[PDB]
Structure formats: structure tokens, C-alpha cells
Amino acid sequence: GVSEVRSDREKFTVYLDVKHFSPDELSVKVTDDYVEIQGKHGERQDDHGYISREFHRRYRLPSNVDQSAITCTLSADGLLTLCGPKTSGIDAGRGDRTIPVTREDK
Amino acid sequence: VSEVRSDREKFTVYLDVKHFSPDELSVKVTDDYVEIQGKHGERQDDHGYISREFHRRYRLPSNVDQSAITCTLSADGLLTLCGPKTSGIDAGRGDRTIPVTRED
């Protein structure tokens, strides 16, 4: 559907279709071992109509994802990709933070 | 997800609202527009949680009888709004809340 999670020995990946949402309309944060994605997008419709859509998603993070290294990219086609590098050892990089939503130039 | 039809007899809106239970939907006529809202609180899904809200507005043709607009919702989550057209000036005009009826 709209939301898929993948996991291999190197990383944890979330793929979320957010078609028509702009980077400025998306907020991505790490909060309490979840990645939180919030979006609100409005647009005109035919004959004076209007549609607004809002959502709030939380994805549970495995303990071995390095929260400080999570990235978020948005494609032209509206695919949001969250990438969470996995780590071993002592440095966990755990902590709440705001993740920049970076549009890729493709 | 949306389609609007408008012929000499009626105005019809088809809208996919599959994520929303009937009680999570509100349809109103406000200042000659139809406003449809869907809102649900945090649900659990396989990977975490999700909440959603939408607000969709449609401008009504001046000759739709607002008082006669009906709204039904299919088991598959398709909303159908229908309003007959009438010739009389301001016939049936007025803000109202339109109950979303289950089709079964």
C-alpha cells in the first residue's frame, strides 16, 4: 500500500508514499524511539473546490538503528524514504532530534 | 479518489473514504458548499501508529435543492452524495448537517 518497512544487516528503511506533499509540509522527528512523520497538504480542486489532507504516522525503531544517523529523502514522485543505519558496539546515537526532509533532485 | 457529475436532474459526488468509519465522517452544507470531513484518532498498524484527517469542499450549483441532498456510504467505503436540481429561486436553501447513511 502506502507504507513499507525493510530491514537488512546494514539498515532499516521506511518507504512512504506522500504524493503532492512538499518538504515544507512534512515534519519528521525522532521521538522516544519512534520516527514521527506529520504532514498537512492543501490544494485547489476544480470548480472552486478544495481538499486538505493531514496525517500523523509513528514508526517503531529497532534498538540498533542509530537515531542520530537517520536520514529522510523525498523524491519528485512523492516517495519519502527514511534510512536508519544500524550499529553495533557502545555508541548508539540515541536521542530525540528533528530530521531534515531533503528533496532529491530527481 | 473523487468524481463529480452534474446533469439536468441532479448533482452527484463520488468520494473514496475507505479509511473512515461512518461515525468518523461529517457532511455539511455551509454557505452553498458541501463540506466533507473525515477524522480518526491514533490507530495501531503493523509498524507503529497512524491518524488521519481530511477536509473536502465542493461548490454546489445554485439550483441544487440543499434540503434534499442525501449521502450514503457503501461497505467498501465509497461515499455518494446526491442532490436534485429544482428551478425555484432559493428553493430548499439553508445550512444543514447531512447524515451519512450506511448502504449495507
Side-chain angles (χ1 to χ4, degrees), chain A residues 2-5 34 45-60, chain B residues 1-2 11 33 42 44-59:
Chain A
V2 76
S3 185
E4 182 190 32
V5 170
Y34 283 79
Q45 298 284 267
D46 182 69
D47 191 23
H48 307 281
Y50 201 85
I51 170 64
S52 193
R53 293 183 182 94
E54 178 169 348
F55 72 92
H56 298 255
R57 272 199 177 272
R58 299 201 280 131
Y59 291 90
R60 191 169 294 107
Chain B
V1 298
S2 187
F11 176 78
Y33 281 63
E42 200 155 79
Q44 159 196 297
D45 69 6
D46 293 340
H47 304 130
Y49 303 88
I50 170 67
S51 72
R52 297 179 182 94
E53 174 173 354
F54 79 84
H55 295 269
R56 163 82 246 222
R57 293 165 54 76
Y58 301 88
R59 183 179 68 84

Side-chain angles (χ1 to χ4, degrees), chain A residues 22-30 35-38 67-75 80-83 96-104:
Chain A
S22 70
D24 285 348
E25 290 168 341
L26 297 160
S27 172
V28 178
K29 297 170 177 177
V30 177
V35 181
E36 289 176 349
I37 307 170
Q38 310 174 31
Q67 293 171 13
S68 78
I70 295 174
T71 55
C72 178
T73 69
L74 176 66
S75 73
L80 185 159
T81 302
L82 283 166
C83 194
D96 294 6
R97 54 176 290 245
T98 293
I99 304 177
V101 173
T102 310
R103 246 299 307 263
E104 56 185 332

